[PDB]
Amino acid sequence: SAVKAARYGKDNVRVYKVHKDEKTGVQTVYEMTVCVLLEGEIETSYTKADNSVIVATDSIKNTIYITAKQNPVTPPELFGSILGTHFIEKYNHIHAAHVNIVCHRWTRMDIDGKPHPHSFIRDSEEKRNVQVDVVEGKGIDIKSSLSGLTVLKSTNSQFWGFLRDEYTTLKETWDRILSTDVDATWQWKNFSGLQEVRSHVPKFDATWATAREVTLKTFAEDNSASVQATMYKMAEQILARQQLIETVEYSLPNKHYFEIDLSWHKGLQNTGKNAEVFAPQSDPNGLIKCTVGRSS
Amino acid sequence: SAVKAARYGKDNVRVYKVHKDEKTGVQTVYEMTVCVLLEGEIETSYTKADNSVIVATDSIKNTIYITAKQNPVTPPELFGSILGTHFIEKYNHIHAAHVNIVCHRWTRMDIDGKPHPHSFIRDSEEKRNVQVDVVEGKGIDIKSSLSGLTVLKSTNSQFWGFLRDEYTTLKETWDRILSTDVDATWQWKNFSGLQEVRSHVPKFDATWATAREVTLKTFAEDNSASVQATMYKMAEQILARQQLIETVEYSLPNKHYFEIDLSWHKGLQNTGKNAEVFAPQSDPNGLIKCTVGRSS
Amino acid sequence: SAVKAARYGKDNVRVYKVHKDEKTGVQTVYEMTVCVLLEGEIETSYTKADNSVIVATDSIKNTIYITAKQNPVTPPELFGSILGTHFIEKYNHIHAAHVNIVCHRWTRMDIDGKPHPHSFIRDSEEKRNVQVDVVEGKGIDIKSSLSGLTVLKSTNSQFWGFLRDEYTTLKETWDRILSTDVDATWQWKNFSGLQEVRSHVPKFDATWATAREVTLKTFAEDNSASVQATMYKMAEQILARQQLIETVEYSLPNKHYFEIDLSWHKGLQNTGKNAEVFAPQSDPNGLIKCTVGRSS
Amino acid sequence: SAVKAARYGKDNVRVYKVHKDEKTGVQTVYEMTVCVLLEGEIETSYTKADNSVIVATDSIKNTIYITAKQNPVTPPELFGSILGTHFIEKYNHIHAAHVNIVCHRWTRMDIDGKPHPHSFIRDSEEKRNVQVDVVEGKGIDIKSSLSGLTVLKSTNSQFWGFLRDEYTTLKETWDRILSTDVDATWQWKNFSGLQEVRSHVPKFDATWATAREVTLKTFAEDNSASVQATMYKMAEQILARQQLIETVEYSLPNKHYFEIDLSWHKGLQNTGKNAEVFAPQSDPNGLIKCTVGRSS
Ligand SMILES: O=c1[nH]c(=O)c2nn[nH]c2[nH]1
Ligand SMILES: O=c1[nH]c(=O)c2nn[nH]c2[nH]1
Ligand SMILES: O=c1[nH]c(=O)c2nn[nH]c2[nH]1
Ligand SMILES: O=c1[nH]c(=O)c2nn[nH]c2[nH]1
Ligand SMILES: [K+]
Ligand SMILES: [K+]
Ligand SMILES: [K+]
Ligand SMILES: [K+]
Ligand SMILES: [K+]
Ligand SMILES: [K+]
Ligand SMILES: [K+]
Ligand SMILES: [K+]
């Protein structure tokens, strides 16, 4: 027995930060949940009860608050990079910092057609996330993503031409409902360190916007041949609009809505072109995944 | 031993309905979760294993789909009334139908500044609900509500002047964060039956809008003296804008955001007027309730 | 507009307490989640921004910890009564205290066939709860319950003889699966105050045990004619074994397990007497309720 | 743009299976949730709308039921291997099958001290899982695990000697509460195919038992120097008791229970050796991970 891999830290650290413009009086809020796990020469904490190598997770928690107090918390890619870099620069024996950040939505309220200076609404459970891995001597690897974006289209979704054998019962369809929870991730080119990350700061919010916009427009306008075909179109467009991204990954559940045959009741017609009332299925659900990169 | 009270039925029935305009091609979707519990001369099903008095919950499920297929599913107040009335009119021994409906949000997508004809987004977990109790010989009682409306204001919330004794540690404040999940219910005047409910149909969507609008504006503009004082203002305004409502009830959690003293670290100032980074508290939470009616 | 009803306090207060026997070294842990809402002459806090009538919810939180420190936290019926009584005795303007307690399971671990002195396991999400309403001049009303007790029987459950009409599709069955999450509540005779509650302390744990035992044995041995018939048998037995209880209420979901016809695949037989593989249904679910009292 | 990676299938497929002994009348139930994702020459389904390469996820669902009907569903390692092998043997273009199975607990009820023939109870949310990856030409890789095993010890947990600097506030302790949700995984040596997996069937249940037993005993008896030190002891013991396992991985959250200083209230002593009432913390939580292998 020997330690082959190990990391530890503090998870689920909720953090809120407010910015107050003294000139305009407008306030802006940010809320996130942070997790920081460290790697390094810490094996002895596991094998010899040597806690001298342990930067207490409680201390990691304090550090998250302190860093948020002295640095911008947005874009999350930047905050994560600053936070991760701190650990590998401050502690000689810590060689990797793994920072995950989940950003919660606090959209400014519009009252009587005017943006309110200090009132916000949680419009959607959709999240914007980042996974920032700061590895000593190996720069900063960043994976940005949007998740929990739940959508549905009532038509212009099809699924036919699939393999049919003795295990097949699914009927081909040229008009079905398509609903999913979008989980899209774009992996950035490795960054040499904080300076390079900072040099590209504007691209983070811009690329998130691009990803979300491409996602929504493609979902709404593509007369889908399958979840697979539609998600690929999203990925290729995103790669074409941001050269600093290496790959785009999508994980999409096919949240099924089943037709309900009611012909047994007074010959009521509710299937095919007559389908109006459907039964949303909680489970099971198809799960379609794809990682798209640039061709050589 | 004897049955003092009893009701049974089907809960968590997911229902989706689509409307397709053949003229414009625009489609509109509706999704809800329905629960129908019946009351009546059914005691023998419990005491003598007499299932002859039982309208199978599976049949109640079928009835929900059938009713949704042959009637409008909006406003929910109407659908609930139609569904409830069906049970007490169809079965002589059933004297009460309790219908609960949770409406899920499927907001039409805007693509390139134009509303899309058949694509929707789940913008928020906020729900619009109704509890419709159809009692034979006693009309229809309806309670409408909005829930899961999560908001936050970064200032203009205060709390001072409260009772202070040996159990008190809370410091008075003239500037704090206020965040809550709004659960507001407006109880309608009893309706004599389906005809009367139908005669007031336009008022349901209109009153829901009023309640939501009053909620948001009051929350955003009231320099709150307490959750209690602010919620009362919301209630009185709603009662003043809809004569057919008898009471307005609010249940609001005070989702605390605690200041974080960081002065122990290099004299960092993060409290009082210097407070920027806060610790959102998952629990516990204050819970403030109030039912407001008209004065005599 | 006027306040018709109002209550406020602190919800979701997590509390852990440990007892350490200095003689044996054996430690025993207790964990619960408490909610205390107060009623009284507090209308002005809502109508006039008068916080002088408000016992801060933060103070209510402190009081919960203090009371747990100076009193037994079990049985929950007792702790709830002590806590509720404190508020109506300490504050002249507070006339009702509503205490809800959810008790979490921390069962002592058995290691090598011997009970461990200080290690515990969360065996099941099943909870033991109490709702204690202390009303000045009207004694103490207590509702005890067990919830989250999930069970399943693979046979000896039937359902036939139910009403059949044009809305019915359910096939009669003489052998089906029955699974539910038991929520059982026994309402105690009103107690005049703390002294009377204390005089009956042993009966609380004893009655909870009786309720759980009757529930499990009846569920396992009754060749069920319906959920209704089986739950009634449980209720009548509990009432017969504890004279101080006035009513017993059950709320049981019928968590359906559907047969899967596989005859389309190589004539595979998986229905009726050949049924082996089933599809558990997440939703919808039947919901059966009954409140049983003593006959006159 | 080109597909770099892709897999798809059906997730959250609930499955129940019952075994009925005609001789004794004793019935035994099994319930699980299955996910099967396939890999292979399917890129064209994403890039050219070529569904001919798609084995419908609905068909994958049917296959799960069929396989469960014609094969043992336990141990899960075996069922997963059989199911995964089916896909790569049946479809020439499918080269990998990824099978995840979550086993739910249905423990036989004991009534009056006797095991009941057909009644079960969900004793704990603890799960037994497997991840079976069947790769054509590369055998079968299996990762077995237990998760959701929630435990707590009230003493014999310590944490001192950790790094202390300007970010540290945590006080050293020689007596604290330790609670966690155990997630333990043991990775098996690669198996050449179904025959080899079948040849080791008895070892699966035996090793799961060993892992659970070592986990519970070590947690209860180790006067813990840290979560790190205690989890390592568990891992090394498991590796020493099953030669066919290559690594053991633990992921443990440190679910904090904070002391509550009540000295501000009548000098009440509730800290240090006087600590009785604690505040369980929902978040944040430490997260400690380690993968232990055999030394060379
Ligand atoms: O067991 C522990 N391990 C840790 O790494 C730690 N950090 N703070 N408290 C802790 N406890
Ligand atoms: O036990 C049952 N009670 C019911 O009321 C019912 N309705 N459908 N199936 C049922 N099973
Ligand atoms: O708005 C508030 N109402 C209350 O009753 C209270 N108690 N503590 N803090 C509070 N804030
Ligand atoms: O879009 C889809 N992709 C699939 O792979 C599939 N399988 N069944 N239905 C499906 N729909
Ligand atoms: K370093
Ligand atoms: K699918
Ligand atoms: K009737
Ligand atoms: K409060
Ligand atoms: K009083
Ligand atoms: K039912
Ligand atoms: K193959
Ligand atoms: K920790």
Which domains does chain D carry?
A: 2-296 (3.10.270.10)
Nearest CA to ligand 1 atom 2: D226
- Closest Cα of chain C to B24: distance in Å? 35
Asked if the peptide bond before residue C72 counts as cis, ω within 30 degrees of 0, the response is no
User: Experimental method used, please?
Assistant: X-ray
Residues of C with catalytic annotation?
10, 57, 256
- Shortest-distance ligand to the CA of residue C285: 10
C184: nearest Cα among C205, C157, C214: C214
**Nearest by CB to C282, which of A167, A266, A282?**
A282
A55: helix, strand or coil: strand
Closest atom of ligand 1 to CA, residue D157: 1
| C254 annotated to bind ligand | yes
- Cα-based angle A153, A157, A159 (whole degrees, multiple of 5): 145
**Token pair of C295, please?**
């006959």
What separation in Å is there between the alpha carbon of B106 and the centre of ligand 12?
Answer: 42
The residues near A23 (Cβ < 8 Å, ≥ 6 apart) are none
Whole-angstrom distance, CA of residue C162 vs CA of residue C166: 13
D99: nearest Cα among D78, D114, D88, D83: D83
Helix residue ranges per DSSP H, C71-200: 76-90, 194-199
What separation in Å is there between the alpha carbon of B206 and the centre of ligand 9?
Answer: 43
Do the Cβ atoms of B169 and D264 come within 8 Å? yes
Q: How, if at all, do strands C245-254 and A257-259 pair?
A: unpaired
- Closest Cα of chain C to D22: distance in Å? 12
Do the Cβ atoms of D120 and C151 come within 8 Å? yes
Residue list, annotated binding site of B: 57-58, 159, 176, 227-228, 254
Do the beta carbons of residue A132 and residue A193 sit within 8 Å? no
Q: What distance lies between CA B167 and its chain's CA centroid?
A: 35
Catalytic residue among B28, B44, B57, B247: B57
Distance set, CA D161 to CA A38, A52, D157, D158, D169 (Å): 18, 6, 14, 10, 13
C-D contacts (CB, under 8 Å): 163
Whole-angstrom distance, CA of residue C44 vs CA of residue B228: 9
Which of A42, A52, A57, A61 to mutate to test ligand 1, by most ligand atoms within 8 A of the CB atom?
A57
C286: nearest Cα among C228, C212, C245: C228
Q: How many residues does chain D have?
A: 296
Task: Give the DSSP per-residue string, C234-285.
Answer: HHHHHHHT-TTEEEEEEEEEE--EEE---TTTTT---SGGG--EEEE--S-E
A203: helix, strand or coil: helix
Do the beta carbons of residue B18 and residue B29 sit within 8 Å? yes
Tokens 């959209």 belong to residue? A107
Which residues pair with residue D33 across a beta bridge? D14, D102
H/E element, B285? strand B285-293
Which of C162, C173, C175 to mutate to test ligand 2, by most ligand atoms within 8 A of the CB atom?
C162
| D281 annotated to bind ligand | no
C226: nearest Cα among C254, C250, C251, C184: C254
Do the beta carbons of residue A275 and residue A259 sit within 8 Å? yes
- Shortest-distance ligand to the CA of residue A88: 5
The residues near C20 (Cβ < 8 Å, ≥ 6 apart) are C26, C27, D154, D155
Ligand 4 neighbours by CB, cut-off 6 Å: A 159, 170, 226-228, 254, 286, 288; D 8, 54, 56-58
DSSP label of A26: -
What separation in Å is there between the alpha carbon of B88 and the centre of ligand 7?
Answer: 4
Which of D57, D58, D59, D63 to mutate to test ligand 4, by most ligand atoms within 8 A of the CB atom?
D57
- Closest Cα of chain D to B166: distance in Å? 6
| A176 annotated to bind ligand | yes
Q: Backbone phi, then psi, for B212, in 5-degree steps?
A: -65, -45
Q: What distance lies between CA D277 and its chain's CA centroid?
A: 32
Is the C-beta atom of C224 inside 6 A of ligand 2?
A: no
Beta strand residue intervals within chain C, DSSP E: 2-20, 27-40, 94-104, 107-111, 114-121, 127-135, 140-153, 178-188, 245-254, 257-259, 277-280, 285-293
Residue D7 zone, left/alpha/beta (φ > 0; ψ -120 to 50; rest): beta
Q: What distance lies between CA A188 and its chain's CA centroid?
A: 14
Tell me the chain D residues in contact with residue C156 when contact means C-beta distances shorter than 8 Å.
Answer: 118
Whole-angstrom distance, CA of residue B124 vs CA of residue B115: 18
What separation in Å is there between the alpha carbon of D90 and the centre of ligand 11?
Answer: 7
The packing angle between helices B227-240 and B201-221, to 10°, is: 150
Do the Cβ atoms of A69 and B270 come within 8 Å? yes
Whole-angstrom distance, CA of residue C187 vs CA of residue B38: 23
| Sign of the CA dihedral running B66, B71, B77, B81 | negative
Q: Which amino acid is at D65?
A: Y
Closest atom of ligand 3 to CA, residue C10: 7
| Sign of the CA dihedral running B178, B181, B182, B185 | negative
A296 C-beta neighbours (distance < 10 Å), count: 4
Do the beta carbons of residue B149 and residue B179 sit within 8 Å? no
Do the beta carbons of residue C15 and residue C65 sit within 8 Å? yes
- Shortest-distance ligand to the CA of residue B137: 7
Q: How many residues does chain A have?
A: 296
Q: What distance lies between CA B24 and its chain's CA centroid?
A: 33
Whole-angstrom distance, CA of residue D277 vs CA of residue A13: 24
- Closest Cα of chain A to C169: distance in Å? 9
| Sign of the CA dihedral running C77, C82, C87, C89 | positive
The residues near C295 (Cβ < 8 Å, ≥ 6 apart) are B1, B2
Ligand 1 neighbours by CB, cut-off 6 Å: A 8, 54, 56-58; D 159, 170, 226-228, 254, 286, 288
Do the Cβ atoms of A156 and B116 come within 8 Å? no
Whole-angstrom distance, CA of residue A51 vs CA of residue D168: 14
H/E element, D95? strand D94-104
